[PDB]
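Hey Z.,

So I finally got round to the protoporphyrin IX containing FE thing we talked about over coffee. Here's the setup:
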Amino acid sequence: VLSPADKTNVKAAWGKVGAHAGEYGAEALERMFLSFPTTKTYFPHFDLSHGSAQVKGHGKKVADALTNAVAHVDDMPNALSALSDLHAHKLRVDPVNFKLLSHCLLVTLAAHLPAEFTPAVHASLDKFLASVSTVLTSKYR
Amino acid sequence: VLSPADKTNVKAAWGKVGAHAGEYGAEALERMFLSFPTTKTYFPHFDLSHGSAQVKGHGKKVADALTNAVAHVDDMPNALSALSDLHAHKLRVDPVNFKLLSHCLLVTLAAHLPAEFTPAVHASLDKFLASVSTVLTSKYR
Amino acid sequence: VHLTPEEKSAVTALWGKVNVDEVGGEALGRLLVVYPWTQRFFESFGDLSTPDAVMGNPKVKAHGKKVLGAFSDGLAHLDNLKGTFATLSELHCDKLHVDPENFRLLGNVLVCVLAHHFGKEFTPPVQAAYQKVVAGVANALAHKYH
Amino acid sequence: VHLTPEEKSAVTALWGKVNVDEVGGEALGRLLVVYPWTQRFFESFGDLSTPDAVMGNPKVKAHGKKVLGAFSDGLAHLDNLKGTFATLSELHCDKLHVDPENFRLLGNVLVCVLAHHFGKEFTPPVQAAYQKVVAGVANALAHKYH
Ligand code: HEM
Ligand code: HEM
Ligand code: HEM
Ligand code: HEM
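And the result:
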């Protein structure tokens, strides 16, 4: 459950991320596949090589989904209903993997935002990602 | 995130507890204290002996908060804000302990309501308890 | 796992009453229903589309008997869980890469099934004894990760 | 932990540039801010009421130096993390009863801090090697629970 301060931090931080969202999503995915190889079994038909166009394209989709969540932070279940169906009902992703991707996104943000990844921002973004993870791993239709 | 079916299952099962509120809440706490002794650190001044009058009175509050949570299932952050202040801001309970008490509540329900504790209901109750747990461990005020 | 003499006797007594053909399947089936993501590991079992389909799935019941059996071996070797489960640990960790949290979930589901079957007989002290057993089992299964 | 010759090389090189006086306190400080229930174990440390109080807390900084010193110990004994952390494991597990997931959290917060400090230099390959190290450390600290 995000407080008003968390929401403000998430909207400001993601706003800072800005046009680099797609790139960060792709880097987060790459860090995940390398750091936690078991996650790769979820992407059997993907070219997961460093810099693959497929991962960059997918990173963009992930980013845009997060941007959408940020813009509907007070009503994420509704805004992410289709993604929840995909991850929770169809793919049945173990929730542990969401902790891994979230951690890799935080590591990516930290690596790219030396001037803005403050402890409060880090804390609000962690809660935001945990909230998104809960929605995507829940079957609520 | 609870589906409509989850809410229907939880209200149908939990509603059968009724006046057993204190007894069952008290039993869940006792199961937790005996099964996971570390949880006792949260209740230093409490008499945690078997038929403790203190445990019984407290167990009744726990069970009634759950009944309340069930009624405001779609508005838990607001309904349980005071409990959140307590567990998250004041007590700082480690989230792991909520999984422990939730499991002990499920055991208690399974031991007393066999006809009601079907696989679907068990699944809905776990999600409901997990949702209550998130609210109580989050600082959103 | 350290069970006092009293706990070991209570655990043994209860287990002797367990239906060896049903309890495993019930525990495994509830694991797949309560924690749906675990189904990803068992898609070869066929239809797992709904709670009733899972619980009535023949392969879930059959595999369930093996799981119960491993628990039985555990109870017979509380002194040497690591060794008893060494092979299963290689299978579950090195091959299937099952996150260890799931081992804990299955143990707790089994506990819910025992409670479900024995009701008041599954007292708080007996549960405490069983929690030591299932935590030891999960621990031994995750040994290859340690 | 595993760590290939090259990974060990990468890990060692990056660690040689880590501020021994600050990084530990930053990791411990961020753990206290991001996962607030962990403050329950540090009441004697003083004011931890705001991110600023936590990050500037003199006790958090000093204590963090010891935490960092422990990671340095692990890095110097990658082939025997369990032994190296034996004393700390008994402290965190038997005396303090810290839930092991928190060991995992602090390790990931440390990774975030390393990423914060090194920027682009904290490449995916370098992170992957460090993830093996923090996982080894968390497992070693949780040893008394196994
Ligand atoms: C922050 C959490 C995540 C977000 C917001 C997210 C978002 C998305 C989006 C937007 C797509 C593309 C959907 C489309 O094509 O319309 C997708 C697909 C997918 N996601 Fe995620 N996802 C997340 C975490 C995960 C995790 C942890 C895994 C597994 C390790 C995962 C596995 C997949 C897979 C396998 C696909 C399908 C790819 C394909 O076959 O085309 N996702 N995700
Ligand atoms: C299902 C989740 C839980 C619910 C619904 C719940 C509910 C409550 C309620 C209603 C109160 C009593 C307020 C009053 O006196 O009116 C309370 C107090 C308390 N709870 Fe919980 N609680 C939950 C989980 C936990 C957990 C997991 C722990 C720790 C193992 C915990 C520790 C405490 C403590 C220490 C108190 C204060 C007791 C005292 O000193 O008076 N609670 N809780
Ligand atoms: C208490 C923990 C568990 C025990 C005692 C246990 C026991 C077993 C046993 C006895 C086998 C078959 C061994 C053989 O004869 O080859 C097995 C297989 C397997 N287990 Fe587990 N298991 C446990 C938890 C889990 C969990 C939590 C998952 C995954 C979420 C899992 C996934 C599997 C799979 C995929 C197989 C292979 C089944 C097949 O396709 O035939 N196990 N387990
Ligand atoms: C995972 C990495 C961790 C390492 C390497 C580590 C390291 C240390 C070290 C070196 C000490 C001081 C030993 C001494 O010289 O006396 C210590 C003490 C302690 N650690 Fe940790 N720790 C870790 C995680 C944690 C976590 C996750 C918690 C709690 C959420 C925690 C809470 C404590 C407490 C309570 C004490 C200090 C007691 C006091 O002075 O009041 N530690 N730790």
